[PDB]
Amino acid sequence: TQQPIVTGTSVISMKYDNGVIIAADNLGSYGSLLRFNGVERLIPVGDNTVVGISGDISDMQHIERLLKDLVTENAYDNPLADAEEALEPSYIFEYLATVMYQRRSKMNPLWNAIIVAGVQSNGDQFLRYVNLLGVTYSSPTLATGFGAHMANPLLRKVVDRESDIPKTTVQVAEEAIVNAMRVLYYRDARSSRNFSLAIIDKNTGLTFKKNLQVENMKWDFAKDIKGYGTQKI
Amino acid sequence: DRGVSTFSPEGRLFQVEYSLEAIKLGSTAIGIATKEGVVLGVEKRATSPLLESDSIEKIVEIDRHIGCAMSGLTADARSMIEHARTAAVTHNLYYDEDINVESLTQSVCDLALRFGELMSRPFGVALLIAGHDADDGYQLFHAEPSGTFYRYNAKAIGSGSEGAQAELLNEWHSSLTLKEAELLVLKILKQVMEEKLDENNAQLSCITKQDGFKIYDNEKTAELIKELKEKEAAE
Amino acid sequence: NNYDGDTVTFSPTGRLFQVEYALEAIKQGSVTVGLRSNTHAVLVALKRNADELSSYQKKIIKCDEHMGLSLAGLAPDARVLSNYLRQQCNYSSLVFNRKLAVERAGHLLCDKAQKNTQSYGGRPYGVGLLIIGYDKSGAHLLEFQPSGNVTELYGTAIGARSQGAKTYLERTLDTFIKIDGNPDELIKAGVEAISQSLRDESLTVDNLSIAIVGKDTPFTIYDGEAVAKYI
Amino acid sequence: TTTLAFKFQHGVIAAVDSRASAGSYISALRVNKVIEINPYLLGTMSGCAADCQYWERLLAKECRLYYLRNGERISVSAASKLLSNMMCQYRGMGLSMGSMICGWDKKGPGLYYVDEHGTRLSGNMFSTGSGNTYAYGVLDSNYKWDLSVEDALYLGKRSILAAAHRDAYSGGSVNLYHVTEDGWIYHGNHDVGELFWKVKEEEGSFNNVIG
Amino acid sequence: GYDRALSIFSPDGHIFQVEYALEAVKRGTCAVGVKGKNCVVLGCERRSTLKLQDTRITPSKVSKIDSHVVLSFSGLNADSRILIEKARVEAQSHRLTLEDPVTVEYLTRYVAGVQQRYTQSGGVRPFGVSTLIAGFDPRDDEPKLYQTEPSGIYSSWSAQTIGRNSKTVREFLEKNYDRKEPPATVEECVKLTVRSLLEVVQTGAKNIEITVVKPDSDIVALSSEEINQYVTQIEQEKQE
Amino acid sequence: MTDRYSFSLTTFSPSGKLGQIDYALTAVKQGVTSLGIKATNGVVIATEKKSSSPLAMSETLSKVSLLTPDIGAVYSGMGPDYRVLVDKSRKVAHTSYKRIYGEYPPTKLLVSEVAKIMQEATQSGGVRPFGVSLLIAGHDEFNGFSLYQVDPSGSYFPWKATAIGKGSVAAKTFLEKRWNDELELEDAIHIALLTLKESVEGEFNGDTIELAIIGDENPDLLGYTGIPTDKGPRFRKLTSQEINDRLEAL
Amino acid sequence: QFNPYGDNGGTILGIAGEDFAVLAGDTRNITDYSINSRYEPKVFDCGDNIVMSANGFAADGDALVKRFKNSVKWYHFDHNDKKLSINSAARNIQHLLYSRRFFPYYVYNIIAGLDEDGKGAVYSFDPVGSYQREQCRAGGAAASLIMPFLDNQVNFKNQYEPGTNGKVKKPLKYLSVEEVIKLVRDSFTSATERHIQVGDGLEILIVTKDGVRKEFYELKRD
Amino acid sequence: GSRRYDSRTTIFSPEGRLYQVEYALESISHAGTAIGIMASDGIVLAAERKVTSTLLEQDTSTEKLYKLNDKIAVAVAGLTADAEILINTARIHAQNYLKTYNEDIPVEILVRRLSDIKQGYTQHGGLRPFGVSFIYAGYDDRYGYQLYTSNPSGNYTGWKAISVGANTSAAQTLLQMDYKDDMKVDDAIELALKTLSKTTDSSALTYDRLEFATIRKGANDGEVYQKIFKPQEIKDILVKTGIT
Ligand SMILES: *[C@@]([C])([C][O])[C@](*)(=O)[C]([C][C]1[C][C][C][C][C]1)[N]C(=O)[C]([C]C1=[C][N]C2=C1[C]=[C][C]=[C]2)[N]C(=O)[C]([C])[N]C(=O)C1=C([C])C2=C([C]1)[C]=[C][C]=[C]2
Ligand SMILES: [Mg+2]
């Protein structure tokens, strides 16, 4: 049993017709203090998977090393390490899911919520969630922390059920993700303007975008708002 | 000296091969499998007339549907029987059902090669494991100290084994009744035994689906001996 | 001679005699054949009986839905090693949701057998194994020796008189490799291969044991009247 | 639950109700609170359902093994003690199990009370569960050693009914058992709803209730 | 720990260490067991090479395992103490877990199991001891007499002897003991036990120990004078 | 790996001999001579500093060792075995005594502990006996001065005076003629130097001889003042100069 | 303080027919007032004509199913490909659950299939391993809403034959698979209305001698 | 591996003897003779030190006679170092019994314990046995005065008079001849010394070559006193009995 110290907030994601998108801001909070402003919380594994992590950052860094070690270990005595016997999103997820549930069963959890986003060998989209309790679930849209409350409602308007996935283009999906990130910046007190976004497409491969900013923000209407009820000036 | 788990130049484990020699010195045990049941019979071989022969327990119940006969260093069998009984009942606990005869035999044979430098030497006893289950019916297995087990329609182990096995070769057919099998075990036991066969120095047993595993009374066996004598005198 | 008392001792020419004696146990064992195409992999095994009243000792063991082996030598050692493979195949599935690669299965068997050849007190395994399987890189066939050496092959055979079947496969190499999408013809080639190792005895209904795995075929074993088709 | 068991002239009676609770919610109307350990041994159940089932089915494993080794049926005294010894290993761990071990052996009929604390009591009559106080009232006023099997079966049946009525966490149905030297005999499943009205009319009891 | 396999098979299928343990038993002083109709008697030889002995405190040959079971032996004396101690512990352990005293058959089976374990365990040698275990089961008037040996085999006997010159006294018992009519009384049973030892013992003085076990935990050891009266009567009948 | 020698390497032979102990005693016989003499008001222990090379600094190699402030030791036989015994003896004096009773052990009991360690090397698995004989001199309040010999077997005997190693047979004879129950410490040192000269071949001076005494309390060697009951160690190693001074009156 | 348990909601329902059995469950997965997934399968085909569902804390439920599926696999290996009977599976699960008597699988488990006589069978468990064969059982969040309805409409409880006035009960006529599925769908439609954790979708697994069949039905998504 | 160098200390010979036990007994037969004699009013322990020197400090020396507690003592024959290991174990066992039951340990119970330890080294562990034979002289309120002996086999027996070590065959004959049941301590003292005087391999028996002890109820009223004789006291009893 512990308590999380340096923390990372929402990770959001969704499926689209040819792949999956995932995003997460670059902040490492120390309680209410916005301590670290250059933290990467999306961690690619090969060219077919991106693992997005929220929660305790020390535990994130530990997981990041487990994944790095996993790639090394898979290459051992494996001539097809960059081909048929490469690491799949489903392999990477199940490994993490096994670890997360084992750690909670020893009453010493990794204090995180993880989303593994990727594309399988056969071109199928992979998107699944796991957390400190070892709880797992999959959905066309997935989000952690505040994202679950604010992002999912917006992303579910684009892909409400399974049959909406082939009807969703990458431009529409990215637009929806970027808008969700803006909404979270308005409303999440432990979020930052700067974020990273990753697209894993079955055709164009892994596109990893860094140093993105929330833009087109509405603040002008604030000038008119005065007092808390009766005040006019 | 030399390792206990050493291979000979011929590719055999010395200790396993030597334990087989101890089994050849053991008293004769015979098993015959039929569609009406499996019969198990043994030579008691008391070392003195003062020894109360009914205390010689070379036929043993493992479960209600599985019996066992032994030959060789019979003291070694006690822990094997204990494990067998535990395995049989433990499976009944975990799965609410009778355990398969083969699965029971396999569990016993897993102990066999657990020796080295675990126990210090192989077992010096061979077992005939007879039983019944719903999947494969009436079965007879021969469990060795090598860890190997063969299924048999009929089998003899102990000192008079190769003489008895040749006899079982000729006599066994797929349409044998239980009564016929009983007399056949008695016939072959009487043939290979040193002393004259009677109800006190030989013991019969069987396993049927209905009644399960039963050791025969000395009064019941005595009648089967008398029935044998008369039918041999009939031609 | 003086250097065969245990596995921890090299001879003056750099030989390990206990390992070589364990290799000898395989040569005494009954013949078994392995061969594959690009779509399927096949095991064919000649089972051995104690006498006419006895059953025919089983030679083929299933390890997973996509993998299994045939044995030649000490059967209990095959049970120990096949049990280990079952666990490793199972660990791969439960943890990584991944079917264990046949090549990696061989590497694991090699390393398990090796530890028994370098340590005092223990002994080498006294059995040879032919592992077939179908994974993400297609059909495979492996030959395991208790020295630790594991070899990926198109076809092979181990046991008594196995040299005859091995020569046949070496001639037929170009033919049987091309038998794609036809399980019955691949088995025929295996049955014809193992037939080159027979003397006096012939293939009967309770004598022959066959196994197959392939693209859309789980590892299944055929015994009894199921192999009468191929006699 | 309510369970009872008592010795008498022609063996021992065992009766239990059939309810299972999850707080206020009745989770099961018809559970079996008696385990047939062997043809001559019974075990009642009260407390944690899982504990009762696991440990008494494990007792039956150990009782079977006794027969195989000794070639003789286990006594009720020995069986009850094996169970109590199991409880003493998990002493303080939080097990909840109250049971009667009923049977017939060489000393005649035998009845032992065993609970989670490792307690082991020999006696002629016992009753366990949330509704035992109600069962004892009927039993104590009507029990004799000189009972007929027919009357004894009814007494235990009626004693459970008493408890099923008043106790909120007892009811559903009644299961009867009669243990003899030729083994135990099951005397059926009796719905309390139907039994109540039947007993009320025939016996004249429960005048307070309107039917 | 010391794991060395001392008891192993030889090419001819023998475990020599177990067989050499039987030679230690052959060296041991003679012990005899005879069961009558309502009793069992245990006779034991005391070698008279050791005089100036304090017979009050010297370990007696017959040992009580419980109030209703006794154990005598032949072979290594030190080894016998280890078996007796284990047996006595098991006797109390059985009473504690099952609430009945051990049967003579069960106690024998346990002691024989211990002896067997020491023939296939690493680092240990077999017990150089054979035992005679006698008594009456709880609430049973049928006499019980069992024998064990280093290999771990055990069996029930109407009458049996072990130790040095046991071949001779077994010869005597085989012709003198009738199964159809066993020693009806205590006297007849003791007389036959003393007679059998007189075939081997030497002097009938302090060389013979007798212990009578009757049903319901009635165990007594005879004194020198009581035994001496049997010795006197036997030889006076023999002079004819 | 693992230490698989869990069995005794010292065993009884048909004749009743414990071979390894005998052979250890043979190694002691080959070793350089050392001796011990007990006086009325002290004990002296002495030996030859047999230097392996003249380039070697023999002052760094200490054959005579302090075990406790009132107990000293010297040996004959294998030096490395002696060195580790001194380390163990120093430690056991603390663990099994001083940390319990708050004082240093008496000579006889420390000897008893050293003896026990040497006995266990004679019976325990996978080890050979120690190839040394020790002479332990010491003082304690209730037993006074004492001198003990300890052998590879673990046996120990108290002596008025004795010698071990190379020329022990001759040296013990020399001591029998000179020893009496009225000797002062200086007289015992004088006899020690005379006895030791017979077994030495080459140079005989303060730099080639190692000699220590158990005598009067040395408050100058205590290192602190203020506690009346603490009067300093009775063990003192004689200097090179102090030896040479007594070699002129020889 | 760390709390190793959680509640993922959901509700399951098993009904045993004369020669068939059904195991139904909603596809909604939740924490607190949020929805995780609208379609997350909860009822699984475990092999040997057995279906299983571990309702409650999803992580513990997924672990138990995973372990039982594994137990079926090793049963085949160890006992010559023998078919695991439904009664044997039940007893095996009891021991899986009790292995954690002091750190329980927080799940209400139900399995369904056919007994060795070919008749329909349902077995119901508590979190610590107590089980029993049942005809009708609802488990999970809306268990208390559904069970009374099944007592009434499956076992005809409190129902009597008109004209007799409480003297003669309604006879216990057997139900067809079509009739059962109607009662299942109505049960989940009613449960969806009055329970916030139930909704999104309904997945039913039907077991007969011919095998395991699936049926899916939409539920209200609010 | 290591097996090559294993002597196998705990095995039977073809004749059914324990090699190492027999060879340990051979060792003990060369040790100094120790004698124990039990009388009605006490027990005597006499023992011969092995070829001593004039420079040996006798008054502070102890190789033969050891105190286990106030009621029980032992005479040693064999390896002294081995004996001290066992003696310290016995001293502890006596104190454990006293702490547990608040009564002094009965003599036999202590003897059995030590003998069981010796037995263990002959059956398991692969170690050499202890090359020691003890004579136990003790008193308790059950059996009164008691003499026991134990040897490396772990076998123990009770005695009226007994010898261990060298020349036991000769010594036992001499004791068997002159010993009587109604004997007293002063007479037993004389017998013990006379026996050693005749069996000794030395030219003459002197005070410096002896260890001597008595266990007497010759303590003021109902209680028992152990007396380990001093060198001067051994010299006086030698003159008294007329040996020097
Ligand atoms: C009375 C009804 C007690 O209220 C009786 O004592 C029964 C005993 C009976 C033993 C044999 C198995 C069935 C129970 N006790 C219970 O029913 C207990 C009461 C209880 C004790 N401690 C505790 C209890 C309830 C809740 C928390 C703690 N009830 C249970 O153990 C509950 C958990 N059992 C179930 O819910 C069961 C279900 C749903 C079920 C069971 C048990 C068995 C088979 C199928 C389903
Ligand atoms: Mg809603």
Coordinates of C-alpha atoms in Angstrom, one line a residue, chain A residues 16 20 22 42-51 117-119 197-209:
Chain A
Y16 CA -11.4 5.0 -36.3
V20 CA -6.6 4.1 -33.3
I22 CA -4.4 8.2 -28.3
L42 CA 2.7 8.1 -24.3
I43 CA 5.3 5.4 -24.8
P44 CA 5.5 3.6 -28.1
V45 CA 6.4 -0.1 -28.2
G46 CA 7.7 -1.0 -31.7
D47 CA 5.9 0.6 -34.7
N48 CA 2.4 -0.9 -33.9
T49 CA 1.6 0.0 -30.3
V50 CA 1.4 3.0 -28.0
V51 CA 0.9 2.7 -24.3
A117 CA -3.6 1.4 -28.2
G118 CA -2.4 -0.3 -31.4
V119 CA -3.0 -2.2 -34.6
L197 CA -0.8 12.7 -29.7
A198 CA -0.2 9.4 -31.4
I199 CA -1.9 7.8 -34.4
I200 CA -1.5 4.1 -35.2
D201 CA -2.8 3.4 -38.7
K202 CA -2.8 0.1 -40.5
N203 CA -1.6 1.8 -43.7
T204 CA 0.5 4.8 -42.8
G205 CA 1.9 3.2 -39.6
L206 CA 2.8 5.0 -36.4
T207 CA 2.7 8.8 -36.4
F208 CA 3.9 10.4 -33.1
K209 CA 3.2 14.1 -32.6

